Amino acid sequence: KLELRLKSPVGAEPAVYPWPLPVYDKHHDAAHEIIETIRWVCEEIPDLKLAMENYVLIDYDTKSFESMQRLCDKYNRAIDSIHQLWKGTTQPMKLNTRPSTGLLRHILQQVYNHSVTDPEKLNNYEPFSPEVYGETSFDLVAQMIDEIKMTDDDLFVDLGSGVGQVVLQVAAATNCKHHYGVEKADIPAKYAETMDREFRKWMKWYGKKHAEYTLERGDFLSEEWRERIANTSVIFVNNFAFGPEVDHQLKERFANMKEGGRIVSSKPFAPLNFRINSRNLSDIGTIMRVVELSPLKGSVSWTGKPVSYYLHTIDRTILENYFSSLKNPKLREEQEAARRR
Numbered sequence: 001k002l003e004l005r006l007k008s009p010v011g012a013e014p015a016v017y018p019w020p021l022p023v024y025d026k027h028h029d030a031a032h033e034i035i036e037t038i039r040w041v042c043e044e045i046p047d048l049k050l051a052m053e054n055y056v057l058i059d060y061d062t063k064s065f066e067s068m069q070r071l072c073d074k075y076n077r078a079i080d081s082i083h084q085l086w087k088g089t090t091q092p093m094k095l096n097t098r099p100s101t102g103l104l105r106h107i108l109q110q111v112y113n114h115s116v117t118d119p120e121k122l123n124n125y126e127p128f129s130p131e132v133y134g135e136t137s138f139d140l141v142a143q144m145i146d147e148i149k150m151t152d153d154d155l156f157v158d159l160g161s162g163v164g165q166v167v168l169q170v171a172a173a174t175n176c177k178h179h180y181g182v183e184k185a186d187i188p189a190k191y192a193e194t195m196d197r198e199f200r201k202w203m204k205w206y207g208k209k210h211a212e213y214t215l216e217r218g219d220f221l222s223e224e225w226r227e228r229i230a231n232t233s234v235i236f237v238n239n240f241a242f243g244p245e246v247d248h249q250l251k252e253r254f255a256n257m258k259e260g261g262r263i264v265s266s267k268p269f270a271p272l273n274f275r276i277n278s279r280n281l282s283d284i285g286t287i288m289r290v291v292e293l294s295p296l297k298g299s300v301s302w303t304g305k306p307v308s309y310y311l312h313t314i315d316r317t318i319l320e321n322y323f324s325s326l327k328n329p330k331l332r333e334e335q336e337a338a339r340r341r
């Protein structure tokens with residue numbers, strides 16, 4: 001049995017790769033995962049980055065066991081010496097910190113590589129499919145995270161969480177305390193169990209912390225989920241492809257959320273320029289502000305168009321102000337004159 005091993009920078013069990021190296025899918029294989037892992041550990045540890053001949057990493061023969069073993073042996077020797085350095089006065093790498101954005105992208109790729117065996121069985125009806133998460137949705141999610149600035153008072157739910165990528169990313173990147181994903185379909189929920197196991201393993205391998213999270217199987221339209229959605233502070237829902245009946249039902253669930261509750265989605269649930277009046281009083285735009293977030297630069301979905309998400313914030317002052325105006329005869333005449341102009 002031939003194999004390649006990479007030591008963990010924090011003394012977790014080593015990553016073991018059999019030879020011949022696995023192919024994970026059409027653009028990802030274990031040889032390049034090994035090279036990228038070494039690169040990302042170098043970003044975590046300056047002394048390792050100094051010791052490695054950094055531009056040579058690309059010049060190894062990924063088809064030669066002897067070449068690849070040479071690279072891994074060089075990394076492993078460097079890790080041993082860094083662990084010795086840390087037994088001295090030098091301070092060890094800080095533990096229990098969150099991964100940088102670049103490291104997190106890599107970790108999520110590596111989780112996906114090890115977890116998802118038949119990518120064809122996935123229902124690629126969203127703007128981007130899970131196969132390209134790192135180049136596309138990952139950056140949309142990262143931008144969203146920086147915009148919404150969640151705190152430890154928040155509770156995050158991904159409705160229709162697929163193989164779990166959004167939940168893993170957000171749980172690794174935010175001070176939010178609790179993170180849930182719920183997914184109805186058997187195949188992605190099955191893959192999500194492996195993703196969960198591998199993410200926890202790799203995060204410990206790199207010495208990085210994530211917040212608490214749970215990936216479940218379920219129907220987000222069930223009665224149990226009504227109460228749960230009502231008590232969620234941030235919802236993510238990739239509703240781009242959902243039919244009118246599903247979006248209608250979701251709207252009814254969001255109408256129970258608390259003030260300041262937020263929903264990020266791939267298709268808006270209300271017009272961006274809602275103007276409340278007598279005929280539209282029961283519509284969801286009466287209780288939320290809706291804005292389009294900055295799009296992802298440099299990619300297009302299979303529609304051929306740029307992609308962006310939509311942020312909805314529960315805000316009942318829209319409705320409060322409308323009723324206060326109705327009360328005042330002057331303002332009521334002016335509202336009727338503006339609707340008719």
Ligand SMILES: Nc1ncnc2c1c(I)cn2[C@@H]1O[C@H](CO)[C@@H](O)[C@H]1O
Nearest residue numbers: 160162183184185218219220221238
């Ligand atoms: N009612 C539901 N309860 C839980 N998950 C749901 C649904 C429905 I409709 C769709 N999905 C999942 O949503 C994902 C697409 O965003 C896809 O992964 C799709 O399977």
Ligand code: NA
Nearest residue numbers: 049050052054
């Ligand atoms: Na170097």
